[PDB]
Amino acid sequence: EGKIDEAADILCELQVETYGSMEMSEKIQFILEQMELSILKGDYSQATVLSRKILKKTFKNPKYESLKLEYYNLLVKISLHKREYLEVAQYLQEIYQTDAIKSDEAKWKPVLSHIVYFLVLSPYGNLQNDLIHKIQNDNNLKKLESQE
Amino acid sequence: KETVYISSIALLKMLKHGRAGVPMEVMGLMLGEFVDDYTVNVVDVFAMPQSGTGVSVEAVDDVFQAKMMDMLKQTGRDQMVVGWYHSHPGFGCWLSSVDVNTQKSFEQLNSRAVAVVVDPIQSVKGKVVIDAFRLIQALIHGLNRHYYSLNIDYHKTAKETKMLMNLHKEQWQSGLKMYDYEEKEESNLAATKSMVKIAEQYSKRIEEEKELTEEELKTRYVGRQDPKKHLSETADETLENNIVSVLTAGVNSVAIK
Ligand SMILES: [Zn+2]
């Protein structure tokens, strides 16, 4: 319930120093719980810090790679709230790099689109360019038409 | 006081890769040696492949890197990785924060590692825009706040230069050639400031020389040269250099147009 604020107060910590004690499946798993309960709490600071504490290289493991879709999806939701964009586009980029969603044509279209829309909304700047001009050359973007 | 010396082959490979990646930014690594606290010397460069994302930490490719390392070992090029080039085409030379974090990832390898930003497009047949510097137009990003600038120079062997000479054969074209103008701005300035400097020396020689004999004067001044001869002398170079300088342009304008 909304009382998950009161409860989740405790688990804004309990993951903290259990780092090496937990196994990353469960461990990271309820780090993600901390995330979504933090957004449903409506407070992004602990979503933010509780988020960045994970270390991305764990995504060498295909197992954890299946999970991280959640991770990025949230990072999107956050960043949308922050009204950042270029950052969003970097995430959607990253998920879009997943073999699992590289494959399926019905997967990567609605993410690829969003990558466009946000690279459009981001303000003109350094990384905007080379990100765009890279998308511009991605063969898959040919399959889309208006967005193209 | 701190500086880097960038060998020619480094600079040319640099500008080549940069100009080739336009309009997307390219990155690579810098091979060299740290002479002292006050110097970094860069003799070599190799180019780092593109990434789906922009130039960033993981853009550095370990496999690629060492794979290049050993294959240079067999050529005797063994050097440290002293810095990393980069390009911000059209945006001038500065580090984005994302440039910064990576620069840190090169701090913890070596504390003196430097960042080199190249800017392909607006670097042009005139001055080449290049920059090298390390952390703590550009002031918007905190040129001095998060990081700080460095200086750059170019090592040239004798033979190197000698190859470069034969690129342009100026033997026919000489006489319509106009040498660099800014340089004759420091010329036509420093010359004048100098003439000022020795003016009052000629003044002191005419007053002192007035009230003191030639035999006494010689004893004093024979060490240095007759400041009247720095007037007579120095006036010239300004004269004729400025007359050929004028005439040359007067001809290039009417003849070439
Ligand atoms: Zn950059």
UniProtKB/Swiss-Prot annotation, chain A:
PTM section of the record: N-acetylated by NAT1.
Superkingdom: Eukaryota
Coiled coil: none
Family in the record: Belongs to the proteasome subunit p55 family.
Record's miscellaneous remark: Present with 5710 molecules/cell in log phase SD medium.
Described purpose of this protein according to its UniProt entry: Acts as a regulatory subunit of the 26S proteasome which is involved in the ATP-dependent degradation of ubiquitinated proteins.
Protein name: 26S proteasome regulatory subunit RPN5
Gene coding for it: RPN5
Portion of the full sequence shown: 150 to 297 of 445
From Swiss-Prot, chain B:
Domain MPN: 4-136
Binding site for Zn(2+): H86, H88, D99
GO biological process entries: mitochondrial fission; peroxisome fission; proteasome assembly; proteasome storage granule assembly; proteasome-mediated ubiquitin-dependent protein catabolic process; protein deubiquitination
Keyword Acetylation recorded: yes
Molecular function terms, GO-annotated: cysteine-type deubiquitinase activity; metal ion binding; metal-dependent deubiquitinase activity; metallopeptidase activity; proteasome binding
Keywords assigned: Acetylation, Hydrolase, Metal-binding, Metalloprotease, Protease, Proteasome, Thiol protease, Ubl conjugation pathway, Zinc
Organism domain of life: Eukaryota
Post-translational events: N-acetylated by NAT3.
Subunit structure: Component of the lid subcomplex of the 19S proteasome regulatory particle complex (also named PA700 complex). The 26S proteasome consists of a 20S proteasome core and two 19S regulatory subunits. Interacts directly with RPN8 and STS1.
Miscellaneous notes: Present with 16400 molecules/cell in log phase SD medium.
Protein's UniProt name: Ubiquitin carboxyl-terminal hydrolase RPN11
Taxonomic lineage: Eukaryota, Fungi, Dikarya, Ascomycota, Saccharomycotina
